[PDB]
Design a protein around this ligand. Structure first.
Ligand SMILES: CCCCCCCCCCCCCC(=O)O
Ligand SMILES: CCCCCCCCCCCCCC(=O)O
Ligand SMILES: CCCCCCCCCCCCCC(=O)O
Ligand SMILES: [Co+2]
Ligand SMILES: [Co+2]
Ligand SMILES: [Co+2]
Ligand SMILES: [Co+2]
Ligand SMILES: [Co+2]
Ligand SMILES: [Co+2]
Ligand SMILES: [Co+2]
Ligand SMILES: [Co+2]
Ligand SMILES: [Co+2]
Length: 583
């Protein structure tokens, strides 16, 4: 396989893992081409690989995968028809050609939404046409998420299969399945957004900013590891994110294996918990190490007060290699705080920095910087107090009513954002409450950071494409440490011009009674926002009193025969009282 990289990779990867990545890849570059067309390209390329395994001497096996992929893209007939100047790439050398192709990938393709089929239909297809069933999904998921790291999407497509295995052969397949599909969807939609943010935050902020976030996260993960070790990994980890964001998966995947290789050797130098993962095969090893549990910190926890306070060379050591010192601070503090959000640990370091800038210029440095660890406690409480205020509320209200609290809350704060956005974001923010309040107190803040980050990012992408607010924009275009407290610090818009009434917005029909919870709930939540938009000035009590009356209205007309007249004639009456109530 010296001659042929193809064969080299068709052996490092399964045929099954290969065929899927080739499919993923082609979708990701050629988003508009049909499935049938692609599975044709897949098989042409697969048959070609095998040939090279047998004889690496076979013609066109010697070629680099870069050259072979491009050659196979330019094979496509509708390349000039559908993809225009993407076809012009095909006239260039393979350095410029591949880079050309990457530049034409649509960050947001305009493809219809994927409408989930009824379980019965799906399960039938899972049985009768499994491969076809499972490959379209990778296709549909990939066309829509072109920059998504193909190997991650390979792990997602197999957890998918395990749900049809489990939920299809069950009494109630629907009630079983759709919460596992919405679950994976949610985990997959998160992972997509996490990859954008990671790549975005590398360019929109410093490599320093990324290296710092990295120090802190890896110091929690591997607490029993020297600054020098941690430091080295931060470097290699940056190298890999900088490359994977360039977009070349081949080098990206290679670097990862190499890094994982380094990690799996030297494992006693890094962490205990890396054994499981380190056994795993190529693509998976890297995947697992990213997710490995935070290793236990050494029993001996030397006071960080001794080194960074209550010492003389604090200001000396800082003067030379301050970013080593700051880094050393952050490392030391990070491993002694795996329950802290990373955006917090960084905030603390920007403090220690900010402090030592002032206090080293000071006449008495020792007495100047003696209360730095007291400047951290307000910063630890703010995110902790919002964790408890919010998880308190959640338990009382349950997920739906929690969501509805958030809807009313945010609609007043930013009434300009479309009802659909507000509804999605609030729903999703509910799931953060569900996901993370089930985590114990320690583990709560990391959890929040992960999910908020994506929810907040997705929001911050959507909005900026179609801006409606100054205050959302300031927060999105702001530091990663300061992005969340910026949103938290939002207040109600007192300048809003209440929306006009429209009865159809508050009309309702019998369907709702038998509808699915999700789609029923969303119907009601649209109304809630629309209500709050139309009457922002209204009290909790006032809105509750309506919500109580709307509730009973449904409970009634869904226990009615000829519900349709009920809904119309009680909806006329409900609407009228409501206007009276809030008018
Ligand atoms: C509104 C979502 C409900 C779930 C709990 C949210 C709590 C927000 C505060 C915690 C933020 C942690 C990240 C950070 O340290 O900035
Ligand atoms: C347009 C949607 C705005 C969503 C705001 C997300 C805020 C995330 C942090 C939660 C902090 C508590 C709620 C708040 O007061 O903002
Ligand atoms: C003032 C204009 C007419 C308003 C009509 C009532 C709309 C309220 C719908 C809110 C949904 C409540 C949530 C629920 O009960 O699950
Ligand atoms: Co060979
Ligand atoms: Co190899
Ligand atoms: Co059968
Ligand atoms: Co998506
Ligand atoms: Co390359
Ligand atoms: Co390289
Ligand atoms: Co002292
Ligand atoms: Co967790
Ligand atoms: Co303003």
């Amino acid at each position: 396989a010296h001659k042929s990289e193809v064969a080299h990779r068709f052996k490092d990867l399964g045929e099954e893992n290969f065929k899927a990545l080739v499919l993923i890849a082609f979708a990701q570059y050629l988003q508009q081409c049909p499935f049938e067309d692609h599975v044709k390209l897949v098989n042409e390329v697969t048959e070609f690989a095998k040939t090279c395994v047998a004889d690496e001497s076979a013609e066109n096996c010697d070629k680099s995968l870069h050259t072979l992929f491009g050659d196979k893209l330019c094979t496509v007939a509708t390349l000039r028809e559908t993809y225009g100047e993407m076809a012009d790439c095909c006239a260039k050398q393979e350095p410029e050609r591949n880079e050309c192709f990457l530049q034409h990938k649509d960050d947001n393709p305009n493809l219809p939404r994927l409408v989930r089929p009824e379980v019965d239909v799906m399960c039938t297809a899972f049985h009768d046409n499994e491969e076809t069933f499972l490959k379209k999904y990778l296709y549909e998921i990939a066309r829509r998420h072109p920059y998504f790291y193909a190997p991650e999407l390979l792990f997602f497509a197999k957890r998918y299969k395990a749900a049809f295995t489990e939920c299809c052969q069950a009494a109630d397949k629907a009630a079983c399945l759709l919460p596992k599909l919405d679950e994976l969807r949610d985990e997959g939609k998160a992972s997509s957004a996490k990859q954008r943010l990671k790549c975005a935050s590398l360019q929109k902020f410093g490599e320093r900013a990324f290296k710092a976030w990295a120090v802190a996260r890896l110091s929690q993960r591997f607490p029993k590891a020297e600054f020098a070790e941690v430091s080295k990994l931060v470097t290699d980890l940056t190298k890999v994110h900088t490359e994977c964001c360039h977009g070349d998966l081949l080098e990206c995947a290679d670097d990862r294996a190499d890094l994982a290789k380094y990690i799996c050797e030297n494992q006693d130098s890094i962490s205990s918990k890396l054994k499981e993962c380190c056994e795993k095969p190529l693509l998976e090893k890297s995947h697992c190490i990213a997710e490995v549990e935070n290793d236990e910190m050494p029993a001996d926890l030397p006071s960080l007060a001794a080194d960074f306070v209550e010492s003389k060379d604090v200001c000396k050591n800082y003067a030379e290699a301050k970013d080593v010192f700051l880094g050393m601070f952050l490392y030391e503090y990070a491993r002694r705080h795996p329950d802290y959000s990373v955006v917090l640990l960084l905030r603390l370091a920007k403090t220690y920095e900010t402090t030592l800038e002032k206090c080293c210029a000071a006449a008495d440095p020792h007495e100047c910087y003696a209360k730095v660890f007291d400047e951290f406690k307000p910063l630890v409480e703010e995110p902790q107090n919002l964790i408890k205020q919010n998880c308190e509320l959640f338990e009382q209200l349950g997920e739906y009513k929690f969501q509805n609290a958030l809807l009313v809350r945010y609609t007043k704060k930013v009434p300009q954002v479309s009802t659909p956005t507000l509804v999605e974001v609030s729903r999703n923010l509910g799931k953060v409450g569900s996901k993370c309040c089930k985590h114990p107190e320690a583990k709560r803040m990391p959890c929040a950071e992960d999910y908020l980050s994506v929810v907040l990012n997705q929001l911050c992408v959507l909005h900026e494409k179609t801006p409606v607010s100054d205050r959302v924009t300031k927060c999105c275009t702001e530091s990663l440490v300061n992005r969340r407290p910026c949103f938290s610090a939002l207040e109600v818009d007192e300048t809003y011009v209440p929306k006009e009434f429209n009865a159809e917005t508050f009309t309702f029909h019998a369907d709702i009674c038998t509808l699915s919870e999700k789609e029923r709930q969303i119907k009601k939540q649209t109304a809630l926002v629309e209500l709050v938009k139309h009457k922002p000035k209204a009290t909790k009590e006032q809105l509750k009193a309506v919500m109580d009356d709307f509730a009973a209205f449904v409970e009634k007309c869904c226990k009615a025969d000829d519900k349709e007249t009920c809904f119309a004639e009680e909806g006329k009456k409900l609407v009228a009282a409501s206007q009276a109530a809030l008018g």
